[PDB]
Subunit: 134 residues, 3 copies
């Protein structure tokens, strides 16, 4: 059920691990329970590396939420959040969503959003053509 490879890779549910930690399971594979506000951290060793949460089917890329390598030039620039989609073979089809760290601007199909919501494409509303002035 659990093995440790010569290079240094820990496999749970498998004897041939592919990652540092490789867990095989049914249903809830891993459960991380905290006695306080917190959870799982995805960290990087350098600001030019991208911490990613990657959703795969049949080990083929499908979706991912990551912190991109936009450089931190000062004033909270760079390291923005992006939700990326991938084709049926695992090659990136582009950032579906991008949130800028410094401004919080939410871009749909937009790499550099200049508005609080910035949509590049078409917009559909089920109830009318105008926003409601909140």
């Amino acid at each position: 059920r659990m093995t440790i490879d010569d290079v240094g890779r820990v496999g749970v549910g498998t004897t041939a691990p592919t990652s540092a930690l490789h867990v095989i399971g049914t249903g809830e594979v891993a459960r991380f329970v905290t006695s306080a506000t917190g959870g799982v951290v995805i960290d990087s060793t350098a600001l030019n590396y991208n911490p990613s949460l990657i959703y795969r089917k049949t080990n083929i890329n499908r979706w991912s939420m990551m912190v991109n390598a936009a450089s931190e030039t000062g004033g909270n620039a760079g390291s923005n959040l992006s939700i990326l989609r991938y084709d049926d073979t695992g090659a990136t089809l582009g950032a579906a969503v991008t949130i800028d760290r410094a401004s919080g601007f939410f871009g749909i199909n937009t790499a550099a959003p200049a508005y609080n919501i910035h949509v590049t494409g078409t917009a559909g509303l089920s109830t009318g053509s105008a926003w409601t002035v909140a």
Copy 2:
């Protein structure tokens, strides 16, 4: 503290692990660091098994971000990214957000987004009633 049960469930910080990996902590329960792009890869062994990140409170479903089981019919159709909300007992309230993998279309309360942003219901904007022509 660390325990390896007979069925094959590794419990870190607990003796009765319910998942294949079951980690218990305070604050930072788990930390996954990368030296490139990666961190947490959620994979499934078949195209009709949905890889999910599940947020729970007192072991009751609150939220989830997953790749749904929409049929991959070709041309990057299917396997879309859904964010789901659950009621106070943990039962699903529906996909609050759905992004199409083929198109990148972003549906808010819209299971079949037809526009780059597609909202079903009301739209509220603090700064007026129209989109700014970008």
Copy 3:
């Protein structure tokens, strides 16, 4: 490159574990594979402890997806979903995205969205000034 220490924290690839589980690897780092719909669960032990997925860079907060601190007072109130952003020194900068658990309302820069999409700020659309009635 796998140790257990006094406080019983398991570290993989490190010998100084700082969390209950601490993994560092080249690339993927941790892969959770499920044989059925399921994946990783982040849980808490009380309704006021908030499960979170925290993206850091050099162990400094950059982004967050977490169940927020709104009080569960009945009718699926409270414990909304939040995408938070942090400044260059890891301090909270603001909740970019907030989804109401009870209503599914999607607020951009709005902690209590009162519309299916509630935007506090400006809105830019590439194709025009108006929604397309769906």
